[PDB]
Design a protein around this ligand. Structure first.
Ligand SMILES: *[C@@H]1O[C@H](CO)[C@@H](O[C@@H]2O[C@H](CO)[C@@H](O[C@@H]3O[C@H](CO[C@H]4O[C@H](CO)[C@@H](O)[C@H](O)[C@@H]4O)[C@@H](O)[C@H](O[C@H]4O[C@H](CO)[C@@H](O)[C@H](O)[C@@H]4O)[C@@H]3O)[C@H](O)[C@H]2NC(C)=O)[C@H](O)[C@H]1NC(C)=O
Ligand SMILES: *[C@@H]1O[C@H](CO)[C@@H](O[C@@H]2O[C@H](CO)[C@@H](O[C@@H]3O[C@H](CO[C@H]4O[C@H](CO)[C@@H](O)[C@H](O)[C@@H]4O)[C@@H](O)[C@H](O[C@H]4O[C@H](CO)[C@@H](O)[C@H](O)[C@@H]4O)[C@@H]3O)[C@H](O)[C@H]2NC(C)=O)[C@H](O)[C@H]1NC(C)=O
Lengths: 336, 336
């Protein structure tokens, strides 16, 4: 758990969450790229069949259609499982970034108070100093990662075999405002302490800084901000086979839902089919589907790969760009 | 601007943002569904050609390859533009939901204070009452929409022709903590006012509720929470043709970036190709690509649609399920 072991702060959880989402997204993108390459190969061989050789080209088209349509169908499930996780991880990272900005508002700006006597919620006070609209805001926050952060929290460290837990920021960071506050009194503050120059309530003597007047009353919000904590959540049950935190068994925390989805995404294996455009002879001969489609296989495609390449892989003004161009169909219709 | 005119609260902005994202996502899903239907048709006709008729089936394959590969290529740009907007709108909705939860923390829980005399930041006070770790939290928040909310804020009201502005919650809701606070004093509170039963600082007489003791000093955070406001941002320039809020011209607010992306997504038109599985004769005859691929067209496909359907659309044990099954390639190899 190199990557998750490096999550110790809101910023580094954000980086883990975004980096794992993109990892799942790249896995799907890679598989879909492989499919489109295979469909471009089939279109390429379709034009060549239109130009013994015909049956051989059709053996490739049939083999290509079979394994590519199979893998496209086999992909949809793992695709959805992985995407559900990538969406939730990006959603969580968005959440954490928003809470980060708010928890950065740690300095308060006081308003002009208003002095009074007894009033809610100090019915027994002889003096009160009431503030409305005290605010706290921070400049735009940004996470700045070190070189090691991005080396540790990296798709290279997110293979399923090495992942057993996630680390998340505790919920209080996303739900709770925390602050320190202090009241100060001097003399006999009342409703007549209506000199507000120092953003407190003063009267008597010479009002001024540091409770200069005879009677003073005020407060300050000296600090705001909720401390982040971290929490570990395992992906698998004790035995290590099943995903923990299955939904449908009672209320769950965010970390539990995320851990379930990441576990299922890690287990959703993608079957990548053979790359048709770099296919070798021994790959086609050894392919089990080519038994039903077809020593005889060699007779038709070649007994050396150097031959199979030259006849079926290397071609020719281009077969591949044409059959994925605005003139793909006209090219096949003319030659047919 | 029926949908955006209905955004008046954080919850309804969230609904607009999520509803417009899904609209863009459905537009892409629809186009990709149309493509896969067309590729399944081409695979279907490929098997039938393997079973004059051959040239006619090949005319459909060529026409199908041409218009489907064209539309797949034409889709990639509008796809990326729309997805960039759907991602940012979902990211914004996540943001707003997190701020909503925090701005819902409007009731403070006071801590046991500590009494003192003069101390930072009241060096001139004779009495202070210091609180640490005052917190405010709310139960889990949820947006509950009315029937009209979902009728007004609806993909049916998000056609580009009717959209000219977006409405967003102002930034203070996502960045600023706001609170009211009041101090109360009675008598001569000092460092000896160390009776904290009422979560204030009391001594003298009979300390107790409502400043029962002779000397008292305390504060309360009576309310927290930042009021949401709304802001309008237009999508287009004054002339109405160009997208406003182009990036690269200086710092921008979130509403401006969103408005730019929504404008570009609204303008990114998707060219949907002809549905091959429901193709009519007059559609194929009138298709301009069929001129180069091909009165002669009718001779081969039929002079009535009822004929074109029976020969080329309606087929047969199924041609379509087979050519998208694990046995698609074996089906073509055997018949070829
Ligand atoms: C959802 O909510 C989150 C959290 O609030 C928002 O996240 C913030 O998004 C903004 C906008 O992208 C981020 O601001 C950007 O930060 C980039 C990094 O800046 C730092 O590092 C560079 C060096 O690489 C320093 O130069 C810089 O001073 C910072 O230290 C900047 O590169 C971006 O700059 C561009 O835009 C600004 C506009 O203010 C211009 O002034 C610049 O010239 C430049 O054009 C920008 O500043 C911010 O960091 C994010 N915060 C966090 C905590 O992640 C999401 O945007 C929001 N999403 C939506 C869609 O609502
Ligand atoms: C990013 O940050 C946001 C904002 O904080 C989080 O959004 C919250 O997400 C949770 C979890 O999905 C939401 O809670 C859910 O609300 C659903 C709607 O509940 C209301 O309406 C139903 C009737 O339809 C009432 O019965 C109910 O009382 C509410 O009035 C509930 O259906 C969900 O319930 C399920 O889970 C809970 C767990 O607490 C169980 O108790 C239930 O029995 C049930 O199994 C759930 O309560 C919450 O509303 C969202 N808040 C907002 C403001 O949107 C994101 O989750 C977070 N994302 C990530 C990935 O981190």
């Amino acid at each position: 758990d190199t990557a998750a072991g490096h999550v110790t702060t809101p910023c580094t959880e954000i980086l883990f969450d975004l980096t794992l989402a993109k990892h799942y997204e790249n896995q799907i993108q890679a598989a879909e790229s492989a499919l489109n390459r295979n469909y471009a190969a089939i279109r390429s061989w379709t034009l060549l069949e239109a130009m013994n050789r015909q049956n051989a080209y059709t053996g490739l088209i049939a083999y290509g259609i079979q394994i590519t349509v199979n893998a496209e169908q086999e992909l949809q499930g793992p695709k959805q499982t992985k995407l559900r996780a990538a969406h939730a991880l990006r959603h969580r990272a968005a959440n954490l970034s928003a809470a980060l900005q708010i928890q950065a508002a740690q300095q308060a700006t006081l308003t002009k108070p208003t002095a009074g006597g007894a009033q809610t919620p100090f019915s027994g006070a002889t003096g009160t100093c009431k503030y409305e609209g005290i605010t706290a805001t921070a400049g735009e926050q940004s996470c700045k990662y070190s070189t090691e952060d991005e080396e540790k929290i990296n798709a290279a460290h997110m293979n399923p075999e090495v992942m057993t837990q996630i680390t998340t920021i505790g919920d209080k960071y996303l739900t709770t405002i925390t602050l320190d506050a202090i009241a100060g009194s001097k003399g006999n503050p009342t409703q007549s302490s209506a000199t507000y120059a120092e953003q407190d309530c003063q009267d008597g003597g010479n009002p001024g800084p540091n409770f200069g007047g005879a009677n003073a009353l005020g407060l300050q919000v000296t600090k705001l901000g909720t401390k982040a904590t971290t929490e570990k959540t395992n992906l698998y049950t004790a035995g290590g086979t099943e995903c923990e935190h299955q939904p449908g068994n009672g209320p769950q925390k965010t970390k539990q839902r995320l851990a379930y989805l990441v576990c299922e995404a890690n287990k959703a294996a993608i079957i990548t089919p053979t790359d048709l455009q770099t296919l070798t002879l021994d790959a086609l001969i050894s392919a089990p589907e080519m038994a039903a489609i077809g020593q005889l296989l060699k007779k038709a495609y070649g007994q050396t790969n150097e031959q199979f390449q030259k006849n079926f892989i290397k071609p020719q003004t281009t077969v591949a760009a044409l059959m994925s161009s605005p003139n793909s169909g006209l090219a096949l219709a003319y030659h047919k």
